[PDB]
Tab-separated table of C-alpha atoms in Angstrom:
chain	number	residue	atom	x	y	z
A	1	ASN	CA	191.435	20.333	45.697
A	2	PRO	CA	194.855	20.093	47.521
A	3	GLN	CA	197.454	18.637	45.449
A	4	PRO	CA	200.556	18.062	47.698
A	5	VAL	CA	203.658	16.968	45.856
A	6	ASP	CA	204.313	13.470	46.698
A	7	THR	CA	207.753	12.736	47.929
A	8	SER	CA	207.659	9.152	49.727
A	9	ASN	CA	208.779	7.592	46.669
A	10	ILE	CA	212.161	9.668	46.765
A	11	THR	CA	214.799	8.713	49.325
A	12	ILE	CA	216.627	11.087	51.753
A	13	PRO	CA	220.257	11.341	50.921
A	14	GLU	CA	223.370	10.880	53.297
A	15	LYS	CA	224.840	14.611	52.468
A	16	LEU	CA	221.742	16.222	53.978
A	17	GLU	CA	222.309	14.454	57.426
A	18	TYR	CA	224.291	17.178	59.042
A	19	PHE	CA	221.939	19.644	57.694
A	20	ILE	CA	219.111	17.920	59.277
A	21	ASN	CA	220.964	17.528	62.733
A	22	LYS	CA	222.073	21.298	62.561
A	23	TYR	CA	218.449	22.653	61.622
A	24	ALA	CA	217.128	20.363	64.249
A	25	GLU	CA	219.426	21.904	66.463
A	26	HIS	CA	218.395	25.518	65.453
A	27	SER	CA	214.749	24.666	66.024
A	28	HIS	CA	215.519	23.190	69.347
A	29	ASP	CA	217.223	26.535	70.243
A	30	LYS	CA	214.469	28.496	68.904
A	31	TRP	CA	212.024	26.219	71.159
A	32	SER	CA	214.089	27.020	74.008
A	33	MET	CA	213.976	30.769	73.399
A	34	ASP	CA	210.398	30.635	73.046
A	35	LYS	CA	209.908	28.629	76.369
A	36	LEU	CA	212.168	30.930	78.216
A	37	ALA	CA	210.012	34.091	76.753
A	38	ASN	CA	207.177	32.526	77.936
A	39	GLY	CA	209.164	31.923	81.465
A	40	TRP	CA	210.084	28.430	81.202
A	41	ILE	CA	212.599	26.924	83.559
A	42	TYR	CA	214.610	23.703	83.044
A	43	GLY	CA	213.529	20.626	85.416
A	44	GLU	CA	214.142	16.874	85.788
A	45	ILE	CA	210.459	16.134	85.503
A	46	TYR	CA	208.035	17.544	82.711
A	47	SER	CA	205.034	19.603	84.149
A	48	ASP	CA	203.359	22.102	81.632
A	49	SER	CA	201.222	23.619	84.198
A	50	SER	CA	204.452	24.439	86.370
A	51	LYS	CA	206.344	26.175	83.359
A	52	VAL	CA	208.924	23.342	83.669
A	53	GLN	CA	210.558	21.363	80.741
A	54	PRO	CA	213.699	19.213	80.808
A	55	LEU	CA	214.265	19.712	77.156
A	56	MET	CA	216.150	22.989	77.640
A	57	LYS	CA	219.148	20.774	77.783
A	58	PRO	CA	220.772	20.814	74.507
A	59	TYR	CA	219.069	18.634	71.561
A	60	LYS	CA	222.141	16.233	71.828
A	61	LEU	CA	221.115	15.429	75.152
A	62	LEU	CA	217.544	15.145	74.087
A	63	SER	CA	216.486	11.541	73.565
A	64	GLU	CA	216.356	10.272	69.954
A	65	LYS	CA	212.477	10.060	70.056
A	66	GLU	CA	212.291	13.599	71.168
A	67	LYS	CA	214.939	14.651	68.335
A	68	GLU	CA	212.652	12.904	65.682
A	69	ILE	CA	210.008	15.066	66.703
A	70	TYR	CA	211.894	17.825	65.114
A	71	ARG	CA	213.609	15.902	62.734
A	72	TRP	CA	210.513	14.457	60.913
A	73	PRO	CA	209.199	17.925	59.497
A	74	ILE	CA	212.530	18.991	58.376
A	75	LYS	CA	212.787	15.749	56.447
A	76	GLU	CA	209.455	15.840	54.915
A	77	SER	CA	209.916	19.319	53.909
A	78	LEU	CA	213.492	18.715	52.455
A	79	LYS	CA	212.403	15.713	50.532
A	80	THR	CA	209.267	17.787	49.252
A	81	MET	CA	211.966	20.518	48.086
A	82	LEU	CA	213.798	17.752	46.557
A	83	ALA	CA	211.109	16.134	44.727
A	84	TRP	CA	211.213	19.082	42.237
A	85	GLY	CA	214.754	18.363	41.949
A	86	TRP	CA	216.080	21.775	43.396
A	87	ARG	CA	220.177	21.166	43.082
A	88	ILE	CA	221.000	21.843	46.507
A	89	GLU	CA	224.990	21.800	46.480
A	90	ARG	CA	227.063	22.287	49.786
A	91	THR	CA	229.812	24.821	48.325
A	92	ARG	CA	233.409	25.514	49.344
A	93	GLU	CA	232.384	27.309	52.516
A	94	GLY	CA	229.747	25.013	53.276
A	95	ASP	CA	232.137	21.909	53.636
A	96	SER	CA	234.523	24.708	55.208
A	97	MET	CA	232.007	25.511	58.001
A	98	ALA	CA	231.786	21.741	58.346
A	99	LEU	CA	235.491	21.130	59.046
A	100	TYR	CA	235.199	24.324	61.328
A	101	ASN	CA	232.762	22.275	63.277
A	102	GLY	CA	219.325	25.426	80.637
A	103	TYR	CA	222.121	26.325	78.168
A	104	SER	CA	222.314	30.057	77.316
A	105	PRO	CA	219.849	30.343	74.394
A	106	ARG	CA	221.904	30.806	71.448
A	107	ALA	CA	220.728	30.889	67.785
A	108	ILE	CA	221.430	33.206	64.771
A	109	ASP	CA	218.925	35.991	64.324
A	110	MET	CA	217.434	35.157	60.854
A	111	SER	CA	215.606	38.332	60.234
A	112	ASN	CA	218.567	40.163	59.250
A	113	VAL	CA	220.093	37.718	56.564
A	114	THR	CA	217.767	38.015	53.406
A	115	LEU	CA	217.129	35.784	50.534
A	116	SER	CA	217.271	36.925	46.933
A	117	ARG	CA	214.478	37.652	44.228
A	118	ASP	CA	214.867	34.298	42.851
A	119	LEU	CA	214.972	32.536	46.274
A	120	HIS	CA	211.652	34.476	47.229
A	121	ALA	CA	210.076	32.913	44.104
A	122	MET	CA	211.371	29.574	45.585
A	123	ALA	CA	209.886	30.276	49.262
A	124	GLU	CA	206.592	31.329	47.836
A	125	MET	CA	205.768	28.448	45.865
A	126	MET	CA	207.155	26.302	48.910
A	127	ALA	CA	204.667	28.160	50.968
A	128	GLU	CA	201.927	27.288	48.065
A	129	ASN	CA	202.664	23.264	47.989
A	130	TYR	CA	203.211	23.919	52.046
A	131	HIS	CA	199.777	25.373	52.696
A	132	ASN	CA	198.498	22.680	50.371
A	133	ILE	CA	199.896	19.714	52.714
A	134	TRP	CA	197.994	21.792	55.515
A	135	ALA	CA	194.983	22.077	53.649
A	136	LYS	CA	194.901	18.354	52.728
A	137	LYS	CA	195.147	17.446	56.494
A	138	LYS	CA	192.305	20.012	57.252
A	139	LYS	CA	190.191	18.633	54.385
A	140	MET	CA	190.335	14.984	55.667
A	141	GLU	CA	189.403	15.738	59.167
A	142	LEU	CA	186.859	18.263	57.594
A	143	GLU	CA	185.407	14.691	56.082
A	144	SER	CA	185.731	13.545	59.692
A	145	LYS	CA	183.358	16.283	61.157
A	146	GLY	CA	181.101	15.729	57.977
A	147	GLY	CA	181.201	18.802	55.812
A	148	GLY	CA	181.389	22.728	55.960
A	149	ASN	CA	183.889	25.150	54.195
A	150	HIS	CA	186.661	25.953	56.506
A	151	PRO	CA	187.341	29.750	56.402
A	152	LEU	CA	191.201	29.449	55.541
A	153	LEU	CA	190.200	26.341	53.153
A	154	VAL	CA	190.378	28.813	50.280
A	155	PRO	CA	193.403	28.367	47.912
A	156	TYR	CA	196.725	29.741	48.715
A	157	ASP	CA	196.347	32.757	46.071
A	158	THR	CA	192.730	33.457	47.872
A	159	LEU	CA	194.451	33.512	51.227
A	160	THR	CA	195.646	37.137	52.024
A	161	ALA	CA	198.848	38.042	53.885
A	162	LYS	CA	198.198	37.228	57.315
A	163	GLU	CA	197.441	33.591	57.219
A	164	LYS	CA	200.293	33.168	54.556
A	165	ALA	CA	202.713	34.810	56.789
A	166	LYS	CA	203.241	31.885	58.724
A	167	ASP	CA	204.146	29.879	55.650
A	168	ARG	CA	206.245	32.371	54.265
A	169	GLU	CA	208.481	32.707	57.420
A	170	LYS	CA	208.733	28.932	57.816
A	171	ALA	CA	209.896	28.749	53.943
A	172	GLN	CA	212.267	31.722	54.268
A	173	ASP	CA	213.630	30.509	57.744
A	174	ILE	CA	214.437	27.083	56.196
A	175	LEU	CA	215.907	28.631	53.165
A	176	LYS	CA	217.989	31.045	55.208
B	1	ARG	CA	242.411	49.143	85.453
B	2	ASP	CA	244.436	51.278	82.790
B	3	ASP	CA	247.444	53.125	84.060
B	4	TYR	CA	246.905	56.847	84.404
B	5	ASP	CA	250.491	57.793	83.641
B	6	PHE	CA	250.930	55.564	80.726
B	7	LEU	CA	247.443	56.463	79.500
B	8	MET	CA	248.161	60.256	79.685
B	9	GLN	CA	251.668	59.955	78.059
B	10	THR	CA	250.442	57.591	75.097
B	11	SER	CA	249.756	58.843	71.654
B	12	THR	CA	247.682	55.542	70.700
B	13	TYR	CA	243.975	55.954	69.624
B	14	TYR	CA	241.323	53.315	69.205
B	15	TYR	CA	237.868	52.980	67.636
B	16	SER	CA	235.753	49.987	67.009
B	17	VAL	CA	233.111	49.006	64.780
B	18	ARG	CA	230.465	46.290	65.583
B	19	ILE	CA	229.353	44.403	62.448
B	20	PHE	CA	225.615	43.548	63.199
B	21	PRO	CA	224.278	40.333	63.118
B	22	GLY	CA	223.143	39.137	59.523
B	23	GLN	CA	225.631	41.493	57.686
B	24	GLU	CA	228.187	39.725	55.527
B	25	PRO	CA	231.854	40.461	57.089
B	26	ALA	CA	233.387	39.864	53.745
B	27	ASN	CA	231.033	42.681	52.461
B	28	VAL	CA	232.774	45.166	55.191
B	29	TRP	CA	236.124	46.788	55.252
B	30	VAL	CA	237.287	48.696	58.183
B	31	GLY	CA	240.552	50.667	58.347
B	32	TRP	CA	241.796	54.131	57.557
B	33	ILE	CA	241.769	56.399	54.461
B	34	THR	CA	243.556	59.480	53.680
C	1	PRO	CA	235.978	30.982	64.124
C	2	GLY	CA	233.746	31.166	61.252
C	3	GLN	CA	229.864	31.905	60.852
C	4	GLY	CA	229.326	32.608	64.466
C	5	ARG	CA	229.502	36.499	64.315
C	6	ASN	CA	226.002	36.871	64.272
C	7	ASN	CA	225.896	35.621	67.851
C	8	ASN	CA	227.498	38.722	69.143
C	9	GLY	CA	230.070	41.290	68.569
C	10	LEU	CA	232.250	40.998	65.494
C	11	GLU	CA	234.200	44.121	67.000
C	12	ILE	CA	236.862	45.079	64.551
C	13	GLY	CA	239.283	47.201	66.664
C	14	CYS	CA	241.473	49.989	64.976
C	15	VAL	CA	244.632	50.945	66.764
C	16	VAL	CA	246.640	53.943	65.657
C	17	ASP	CA	250.012	54.900	67.266
C	18	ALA	CA	250.543	58.496	66.271
C	19	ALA	CA	253.959	58.730	67.711
C	20	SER	CA	255.189	55.507	65.752
C	21	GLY	CA	252.950	55.684	62.826
C	22	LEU	CA	252.170	52.049	63.159
C	23	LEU	CA	248.674	51.078	62.420
C	24	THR	CA	247.543	47.633	64.070
C	25	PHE	CA	243.879	45.906	64.166
C	26	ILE	CA	242.389	43.808	66.953
C	27	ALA	CA	239.389	41.358	66.319
C	28	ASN	CA	237.627	39.752	69.160
C	29	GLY	CA	240.623	40.237	71.248
C	30	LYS	CA	243.554	38.875	69.273
C	31	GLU	CA	245.990	41.030	67.240
C	32	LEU	CA	245.629	40.467	63.465
C	33	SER	CA	248.614	39.861	60.952
C	34	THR	CA	247.761	42.918	58.951
C	35	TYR	CA	249.739	45.962	60.001
C	36	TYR	CA	250.590	49.373	58.038
C	37	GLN	CA	253.386	51.904	58.672
C	38	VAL	CA	252.487	55.371	57.458
C	39	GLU	CA	254.758	58.313	56.665
C	40	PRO	CA	254.914	61.401	59.372
C	41	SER	CA	252.367	63.953	59.064
C	42	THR	CA	249.685	61.580	57.644
C	43	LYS	CA	245.994	62.543	58.114
C	44	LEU	CA	244.050	59.365	58.695
C	45	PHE	CA	240.268	59.139	58.589
C	46	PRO	CA	238.273	56.332	60.289
C	47	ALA	CA	236.410	54.587	57.532
C	48	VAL	CA	234.219	51.566	57.219
C	49	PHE	CA	233.350	50.230	53.733
C	50	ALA	CA	230.430	47.962	53.701
C	51	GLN	CA	227.792	46.506	51.026
C	52	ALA	CA	224.648	46.144	53.116
C	53	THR	CA	222.914	42.699	53.129
C	54	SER	CA	221.049	43.874	56.302
C	55	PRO	CA	218.583	46.647	57.329
C	56	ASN	CA	221.364	47.412	60.288
C	57	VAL	CA	224.878	47.437	59.040
C	58	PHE	CA	227.853	48.100	61.201
C	59	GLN	CA	228.218	50.764	63.936
C	60	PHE	CA	231.110	53.145	64.853
C	61	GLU	CA	232.088	52.865	68.637
C	62	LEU	CA	234.309	55.407	70.298
C	63	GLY	CA	235.354	53.314	73.070
C	64	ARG	CA	238.865	52.915	74.722
C	65	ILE	CA	240.674	49.514	75.347
C	66	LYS	CA	243.064	49.006	77.963
C	67	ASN	CA	246.182	51.488	77.944
C	68	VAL	CA	244.992	53.324	74.736
C	69	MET	CA	243.673	57.016	74.525
C	70	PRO	CA	240.124	56.920	72.889
C	71	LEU	CA	239.357	58.835	69.578
C	72	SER	CA	238.176	61.964	70.627
C	73	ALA	CA	241.361	63.027	72.407
C	74	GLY	CA	243.364	62.448	69.100
C	75	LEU	CA	240.513	64.144	67.085
C	76	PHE	CA	240.049	67.236	69.404
C	77	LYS	CA	242.961	69.470	70.736
C	78	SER	CA	240.760	70.408	73.539
C	79	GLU	CA	239.973	67.214	74.846
C	80	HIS	CA	243.729	65.850	74.327
C	81	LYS	CA	244.005	65.044	77.814
C	82	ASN	CA	240.628	63.879	78.642
C	83	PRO	CA	240.428	59.987	78.828
C	84	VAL	CA	236.761	59.869	78.832
C	85	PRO	CA	235.308	58.802	75.342
C	86	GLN	CA	233.368	61.619	73.563
C	87	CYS	CA	231.386	62.041	70.423
C	88	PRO	CA	230.925	65.916	70.104
C	89	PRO	CA	228.697	67.173	67.380
C	90	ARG	CA	231.323	68.051	64.834
C	91	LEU	CA	232.115	64.419	64.459
C	92	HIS	CA	229.586	62.942	62.081
C	93	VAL	CA	229.591	60.129	59.248
C	94	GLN	CA	230.265	61.287	55.637
C	95	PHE	CA	229.444	59.149	52.838
C	96	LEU	CA	231.011	59.251	49.407
C	97	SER	CA	228.694	60.573	46.606
C-alpha cells in the first residue's frame, strides 16, 4: 500500500531558491543535450515532428511557465527530503560559489563525482519513497481502469535492479 | 608559430596534466620531485 | 573561477627553465604566483600526487606551449634538438609503494 511521505504541510525555504534555480538550469541543459543527441535544432516555432524546439534557448529566456515545468518536481523532491528533516546546510564553499556567481550544451558530467556510503543509504531510501510516489499515481490510474496488478506494482524491495536504476539515478543526480 | 631559433636555443621544458572532470582539484597536486 | 573545471580542461602546466633553474606553473593560460628556484645540477622528476575521487584521475600530457621545448627533448639526449613531442617506451609512470 504505497505511503508517500506527505510534505504539503511543510513550506519551502528561501535558502533553497538559488539551488532550485540552478538545478532547473542543469535539468534544462540536460534536456538540451538530450534533444541535440536526438538531433533537435532550435527554432522560433515549436514542431515536434520537425525536430525543432525554441527551448534550447537558455532556461532564463524560457518563460516562467515553461520554467515551472522543471521547477515543480525539484521543489516537490526537495520538500520530500526536507520532511524527514535532513539538515541541508550551505557550507563556506557553497556560499563561496554563490558569490563566485541553441547555446553550446554545457553541463557537468555527473557520473564522475561519487556520493558516499551514507549518502548512498540516503539515495536508496529516497528511491524507495520515490518509487512510492510513482506507485501511488500508478494505483490511482489503476482504479481508473478498474483492476489488475501492474507488473512493476510490486514493492521497491521486490523490484529488481533495472527498474530501480531510474530511481537511483534520479536520486544520485540530485544528491550530486 | 614558434620561432625556430629561440625554440632551438632555449633550455625550457614543459609538460601539462589534465585533471579529468569529477576529480577534486584540491585532492591533486602537480609539480616536480627529486 | 571555481567549480567549473569539469566543463573542460583544468590543464595545469609545469614550466622548467634548465638554464636558469626557475620553475613556473601556468593554469588555463595564466602564470600562477607560485615559483621555485632550484640549485644547479638538480634532477627533477615530473610528479603528480592525487587522491582519486573519480574512475578517471589526471592525465600526463607531453605537449609543448609556444616557445618551449617539449619534455622529450630534455629527457632524451638523442632528441635534444627534436621539437616534436615524443613518448618513447622508456618513459613510464611510476608510483610509490
